[PDB]
Design a protein around this ligand. Structure first.
Ligand code: HEM
Length: 291
């Protein structure tokens, strides 16, 4: 099953920069969301969950078809809370009705990372909406109560290696767990709407205690008021992941570069880009544009 990228008719970099900008301006405006975290983190998570249903074995799921717009995927228990990101994007899509759903969901993630002072993430257009019956079934997104061997095997299905996995998990600097969505509660760190390598620093430097939360699930908690999921903590339990956590804790630029590559790859899995497709776009931030 081949998904060939097909550029929205007549569109070029400037059209997508306008979409970026609209997302970015709304992120600035709607700053009160989630006790003033803002929408950056949930948009990053929406981009990831809409891409992370991919199965390399048969090219089902993935970002291309924008299938989160259908009830089976939007109602996935694993996607609880992402409705907020979708609602954010609704007025964006109304203003730019020509962008595909998959391009919008993925671009929302890129925009959020960059506006939150993260790395530049090159982004390619040309995802095409596919019909309801192409929506992947629930259950392809990961469980949080598991160990490093689970994490490693899970991400093989997404064609991600150890370094790509550890880099992608650094997105957990952002936002928080919310008990009613996932059965976990609390932020991973202090700077939870600015993209930094704080996740790795907190894993290595906080004093974590294994506790039960009010949903009766185990999570790791610190006296600073931070938490880690069992799957997060697995990155310092496994000696191969641990080495990479230490690397990113000690090298902000390396983390940024590796994250950018892995995140673009996640957002592009399953898509065939023709030879003569446009090169990936690197959007300017609002700040870079003086906006
Ligand atoms: C083993 C893999 C992973 C597991 C089990 C996991 C699990 C979770 C859970 C349980 C939450 C809390 C959701 C809520 O209560 O609202 C969450 C939040 C989040 N995850 Fe992950 N995650 C994984 C990987 C990733 C990756 C690869 C990214 C993106 C690159 C990502 C980005 C986020 C973000 C940004 C949030 C915060 C959302 C918000 O504040 O609304 N996660 N994750």
């Amino acid at each position: 099953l081949v998904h060939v990228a097909s550029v929205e008719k007549g569109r070029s970099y400037e059209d997508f920069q306008k979409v970026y900008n609209a997302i970015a301006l709304k992120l600035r405006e709607d700053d009160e969301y989630d006790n003033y975290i803002g929408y950056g983190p949930v948009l990053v998570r929406l981009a990831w969950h809409t891409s992370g249903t991919w199965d390399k074995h048969d090219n089902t799921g993935g970002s291309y078809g924008g299938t989160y717009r259908f009830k089976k995927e939007f109602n996935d228990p694993s996607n609880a809370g992402l409705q907020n990101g979708f609602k954010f994007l609704e007025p964006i899509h109304k203003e730019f009705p020509w962008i595909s759903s998959g391009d919008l969901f993925s671009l929302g993630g890129v925009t959020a990372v960059q506006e939150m002072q993260g790395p530049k993430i090159p982004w390619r257009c040309g995802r095409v909406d596919t019909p309801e019956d192409t929506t992947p079934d629930n259950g392809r997104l990961p469980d949080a109560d598991k160990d490093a061997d689970y994490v490693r095997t899970f991400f093989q299905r997404l064609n991600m290696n150890d370094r790509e996995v550890v880099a992608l998990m650094g997105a957990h600097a952002l936002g928080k767990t919310h008990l009613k969505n996932s059965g976990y509660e609390g932020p991973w760190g202090a700077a939870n709407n600015v993209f930094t390598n704080e996740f790795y620093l907190n894993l290595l430097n906080e004093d974590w205690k294994l506790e039960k939360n009010d949903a009766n699930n185990e999570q790791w908690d610190s006296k600073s008021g931070y938490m880690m999921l069992p799957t997060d903590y697995s990155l310092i339990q496994d000696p191969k992941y641990l080495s990479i956590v230490k690397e990113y804790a000690n090298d902000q630029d390396k983390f940024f570069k590796d994250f950018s590559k892995a995140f673009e790859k996640l957002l592009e899995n399953g898509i065939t880009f023709p030879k003569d497709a446009p090169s990936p776009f690197i959007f300017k931030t609002l700040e870079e544009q003086g906006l």
